[model samples]
Target: MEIYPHIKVYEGTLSRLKPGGAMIAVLEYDVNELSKHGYTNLWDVQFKVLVGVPHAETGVIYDPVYEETVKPYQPSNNLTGKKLYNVSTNDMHNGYKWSNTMFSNSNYKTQILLTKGDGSGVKLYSKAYSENFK
Candidate 1:
């Protein structure tokens, strides 16, 4: 994902609502780009989440797919658990151009959650980015 050049991915947590519970993935990133622009808070920080299937044999995720807005929800026919792709993008267009495409049923395993305690109210999760799978 093309983040705002200098901004980095901060540490975050990942959790499954069922079974194993929560798994945390620590991310560290530098936001010199945002800082230069006088953006101190994360409000200006942008990011994207891509979903994919983990290939145990090759140790590489494959079958990249992008989601599209569909009826009832944004649906990607290729993203039915088998499809691996990025769900979130750092691009500013998300909130403007494709607002409807932002949240649809086509999304596969990846999810963005808003929590009160963890700070980031919003968390991204999927089979590829998570340590445990449902």
Candidate 2:
């Protein structure tokens, strides 16, 4: 097992469903240069949800769920380094659905945090959106 220095997140989106009132997101990421050294087990990856309304004047955002005690959804996989990883579907859901507050047409943010079972450092990635209904 090898420890990775960091991970990079790219090409992500949060799609809101009109009928079901549920939001789905896809995250594509890859391990950093350290991956070139070798492969390591991606122990865990979590997605923390944030719901907020943006201020038009200052472009500042406010999240109702910011202070709420909510646990992030974790993707289940035995992923390894040196390749791209995608987390969606069952991996993003663990019985509980994303709060309806997240569907309020407000500015929403998804914060991704990841760690390696090989004792690598942790990495954080954040993405914000202005409501993507599909």
Candidate 3:
């Protein structure tokens, strides 16, 4: 299952994220890899990127928004050859948005997510890296 991961996020950087300034996390997803499995067109499946923020007093917030040119949950989903695997979709904080507070709090969980109507699903999580931010 290659650790059963379908989506690999790379070259990700968060910059100019301070308040009064918009937060930005420039990222890359190895979307073409899905072609190796059963996916035909990139649009064959939905892509949901759920990046979240951690908090102690309140709760977590989400982003890494899935603004795919193609709409998710299309009629065209599922595989024709090798089957698909699934991963963790933490619904603990299931909504998405970007706020300066998140930029300050700074702990996060970014995941690649989506599903097929036939019960097939896909999810991938990014590993943690330590960085110094003021």
Candidate 4:
């Protein structure tokens, strides 16, 4: 079937946040195929920010800096849904925009994790930077 559950960050809302500015992380998803895979409902969902490069001390790539739980997600058959999160550029250590930054030059990433009530789940990942931002 189609990719069981897919997610993407809303570009419009992402672009509006300036350096150190706060904005909503608008996430859109398609969960049509998940139910067919025996996932009746989602128990937990989380979003996090990741650095595009490895950390200097530990050499760990995709170093996660912040995590936020997305609550009250209810899934259904072949349906599209949206989730919102309040985030800020300051959430990261440098207080820089995800794009046009000295760090990785727009290579930063964002990740989403979804878990079924039965403890099985999927993770959706996407870039945090965009070239179209003003």
Candidate 5:
């Protein structure tokens, strides 16, 4: 099955205040395949993100049951106006626009690219930001 790639960009809101703080990024895949197995809205999926090279980190994620609930759930819904990852809405800005960064070869591609607001360092990936590009 083809996986749909999604991205979330952080514009230095968290990095500026917390410095090396990390945040979790959850990507929703096609749940139809899971639903075929009788799984419900809260089904969890495992994914990984890598920065720089071979080193990668994995995280567990839950899929929201939008189709079943008949109400579309945006990522922001899961994160309301609360302080998620110790960062507020003022911390990061997200874009609805997505880029085609899946893959052209055997190598995996980065869906999201995170950088400092000043644009000095390399790209950062993963919810935790531990997987960062050099």
Candidate 6:
């Protein structure tokens, strides 16, 4: 029972990462009838993927980050088959917003969601930064 053509329930496991590096995944989907909610803007969109590594002995987990905005595009047939590729985000700064680490491996599961952040959302929003958009 998928409302939208693409409502993700994905989670990457035991993924590997490198220092000063980024992990990119290529995803494609059909014309989500769900876009009718009017949350197609950059500020209200998110494509988060929990990335981190488990402690060797301490039994603790270290999560770096993958919270970003899905640079939504419509190549090929437009509404027929939509693609989700160019995704990036972070606070504006001089250098990189995401931190660099020497991670052996991470079991963080990537998250995906296609919805609104305002009153028209199937979900909700964090006004901390979301409100600024409106």
CA RMSD of each candidate after superposition: 18.1, 11.6, 13.7, 11.2, 18.3, 13.8
lDDT (Cα, tens digit) per residue for candidate 5, span 1-134: 99978976655322221122222343343445334444343222222222222234443112211101011123433333221122221112322111111121223322233233333333333342222211
lDDT of 4: 0.41
lDDT of 6 by residue, 63-128 (tens): 435444444332233334353433333323414333232232333333333444432455422211
What digit string (tens of lDDT, one per residue) describes model 3 on residues 1-134? 34765875654334333333323333233445555444454444443434454334433223432221112322222344333332222222333232322333556533334444332545333332113223
C-alpha TM-scores of all predictions: 0.23, 0.41, 0.32, 0.41, 0.22, 0.36
Candidates' lDDT values, in order? 0.31, 0.41, 0.36, 0.41, 0.27, 0.36
Displacement of residue 104 (Cα, Å) in model 4 is 9.7
Q: Give lDDT tens digits, candidate 2, residues 1-134.
A: 98988876744455443323444544445666534434344333333444454445643344435422223344554356333333332324543344444543444543333344333454443344544531
Candidate 2: deviation at residue 7, Å?
32
Query: Candidate 4 on 5-88: residue-level lDDT in tens?
Result: 777654443434343443334444544544544444433444444434444564334555543443432323333443333333
Ordered from best to worst TM-score, the candidate numbers read: 2, 4, 6, 3, 1, 5
> Count of backbone clashes for each model?
19, 0, 1, 0, 1, 0
For model 6 the local lDDT of residue 41 reads 49
Better of 3 and 6 by TM-score: 6
Candidate 4 backbone overlaps, count:
0
lDDT of 1 by residue, 1-134 (tens): 75666765644333222222222222222345334434454332333333344466743334434432211111133322232122233224344222222223233233332112223333322234332333
